[PDB]
């Protein structure tokens, strides 16, 4: 998934006026194929990645809105490994972050302290010097915050430990 997302980003940065290109490969011997997809929508917003419902008419209008995967596969470099390696090492840090989440749950049940990094509206952050991070639902960076976590929701691009006080 990290490799196909890196190739998708590499093909995205390659083209100028063509965005939202995906690629799926889940086999060892099976090579990867780059099939650029369009967003199924009845409007004309984003004319570079939008498609009409008449293309789904071949499927008897079975493709409901919100899911956009259908198109003919097109033609599929060593320089692409530069951005590919960055995505790989990024997911390793995310996988290592999930390891700290599992280790935290094994030793959970005590009040912890955290340092705020940024003051995003309705979402602060915490800091623990163990390659970990936590956020609290709605301080200034540099102050220690006391909070007990109770649940973790699967946030996009990696889950985050949600902490609550009330």
């Amino acid at each position: 998934e990290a490799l196909e997302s890196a190739l998708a980003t590499a093909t995205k940065k390659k083209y100028e006026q063509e965005i939202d290109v995906r690629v799926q490969i889940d086999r060892k011997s099976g090579d990867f194929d780059t099939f650029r997809r369009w967003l199924v929508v009845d409007e004309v917003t984003q004319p570079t990645k939008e498609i009409t419902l008449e293309a789904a008419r071949y499927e008897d209008e079975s493709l409901n809105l919100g899911d956009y995967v259908e198109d003919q596969i097109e033609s599929v470099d060593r320089i692409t490994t530069q951005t590919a390696k960055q995505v790989i090492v990024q997911k390793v840090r995310e996988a290592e972050r999930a390891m700290v989440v599992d280790q935290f749950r094994e030793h959970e049940g005590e009040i912890i302290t955290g340092v705020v990094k940024k003051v995003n509206r309705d979402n602060i952050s915490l800091d623990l010097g163990n390659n970990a991070e936590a956020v609290i639902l709605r301080f200034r960076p540099g102050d220690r915050v006391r909070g007990v976590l109770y649940s973790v929701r699967p946030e996009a691009r990696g889950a985050q430990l949600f902490v609550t006080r009330s």
């Binding site: 499927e59 008897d60 079975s62 493709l63 259908e70 003919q72």
Partner: protein, 415 residues
């Protein structure tokens, strides 16, 4: 314009029809290429093309043909996953509807509109009870193998009824060493079922068998015969076996009586044992830890449904084949089913048919298929046959059955 209609036509009519249309020389061409050319030229006029076949979901699916024993062919009907998401189709659902030839860039026929699902309207198939939701029960309806006409072929069915009665949804095993007469016994069962119960769908499935018995079975019985000779690998043996059981399960869900006569339970276990990935745990006899998980799944599928329909699977087992693996397979399958039809090789070599071990035979809960007086007469017959030897019992049975024509007159004279 149907796919199966043009496929059953001989090569002479296909070549002659193509020459009148003014196309390339069809003599030095395959049969599938000729029909492919005819369907394209006929579609350019504006007419519609229809097809049929059992669906084989890979996300996309294919409508395999019946004459090819459900084998991957170039003329398979492509079923896009979008169509499988609309009608919610599964593996085994026969799809008979309008099709179109593959256009530029395509290689398989596409399904435009489905007209018939599982030999029924799609409206009745969209609301159906799954096979796993059906409440299973024991055999209630009696499938009397005895025809009653009085032919010498019916003698095998008569002994089978007096030894182990078979009903709708019954699951039995015919234990027999090699060279015992399983082919003649299976053909007698197929003829007796089709003659007595023509409503029961008869399917003679052959897996890892010889091509001699394949053409001999198709030209003898009156029904659908799906066979897969050993010329195909064990992977094809698995796929053909799955396509039959999936087609059978979908028909039972439509309240149909499907009967499968597969004499390959021993070979199918070897087929799964070959295609299973190595796990590092080998049991006694060279069987993987999960090599038997699949054949037991297919074997246990046979059950009697109370809401409607039934799935009958009568398979023959092989013993004393010189390999210890077949003994372990037989031993695990001996205590799995509820009907064991043992055949003696010693009696079979003496040309005494049917060489059925009447003492070792039996049926669990046999009172649900036979009456009280019939069960008593079978008990009296066992008390007389058991003291006599195996060969003596067969000679006693043949001499007694030769006095009359039906088993009813025989039981009446013994009392």
């Amino acid at each position: 314009m149907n796919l199966t209609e043009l496929k059953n036509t001989p090569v002479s009519e296909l070549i002659t029809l193509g020459e009148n249309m003014g196309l390339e020389n069809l003599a030095r061409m395959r049969k599938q290429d000729i029909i492919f050319a005819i369907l394209k030229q006929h579609a350019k006029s504006g007419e519609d093309i229809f097809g049929d076949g059992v669906l084989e979901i890979l996300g996309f699916g294919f409508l395999r043909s019946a004459d090819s024993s459900y084998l991957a062919g170039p003329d398979d009907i492509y079923v896009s996953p979008s169509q499988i998401r609309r009608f919610n189709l599964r593996t085994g659902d026969t799809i008979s509807g309008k099709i179109r030839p593959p256009k530029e860039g395509e290689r398989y026929f596409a399904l435009l509109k489905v007209n018939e699902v599982n030999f029924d309207k799609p409206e009745n198939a969209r609301n159906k009870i799954l096979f796993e939701n059906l409440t299973p029960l024991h055999a209630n309806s009696r499938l009397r193998m005895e025809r009653g006409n009085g032919s010498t072929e019916d003698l095998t069915a008569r002994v089978l009824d007096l030894a182990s009665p078979i009903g709708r949804g019954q699951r039995g095993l015919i234990v027999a060493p090699p060279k015992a007469g399983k082919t003649m016994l299976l053909q007698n069962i197929a003829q007796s079922i089709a003659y007595n119960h023509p409503d029961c769908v008869l399917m003679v499935l052959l897996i890892d068998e010889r091509p001699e018995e394949v053409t001999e079975m198709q030209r003898l019985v009156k029904g659908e015969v799906v066979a897969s000779t050993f010329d195909e690998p064990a992977s094809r043996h698995v796929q053909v076996a799955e396509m039959v059981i999936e087609k059978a399960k979908r028909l039972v869900e439509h309240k149909k009586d499907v009967i499968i006569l597969l004499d390959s339970i021993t070979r199918l276990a070897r087929a799964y044992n070959t295609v299973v990935p190595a796990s590092g745990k080998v049991l006694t006899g060279g069987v993987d830890a999960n090599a038997l998980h699949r054949p037991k799944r297919f074997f246990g599928a046979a059950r009697n449904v109370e809401e409607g329909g039934s799935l009958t699977i009568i398979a023959t087992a092989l013993i004393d084949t010189g390999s210890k693996m077949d003994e372990v397979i037989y031993e695990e399958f001996k205590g799995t089913g509820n009907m064991e039809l043992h055949l003696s090789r010693k009696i079979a070599e003496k040309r005494v048919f049917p060489a059925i071990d009447y003492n070792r035979s039996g049926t669990r809960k046999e009172e649900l298929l036979t009456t009280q007086e019939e069960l008593q007469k079978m008990w009296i017959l066992r008390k007389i046959i058991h003291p006599m030897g195996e060969i003596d019992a067969m000679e006693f049975l043949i001499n007694k059955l030769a006095m009359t024509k039906t088993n009813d007159d025989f039981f009446e004279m013994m009392k």
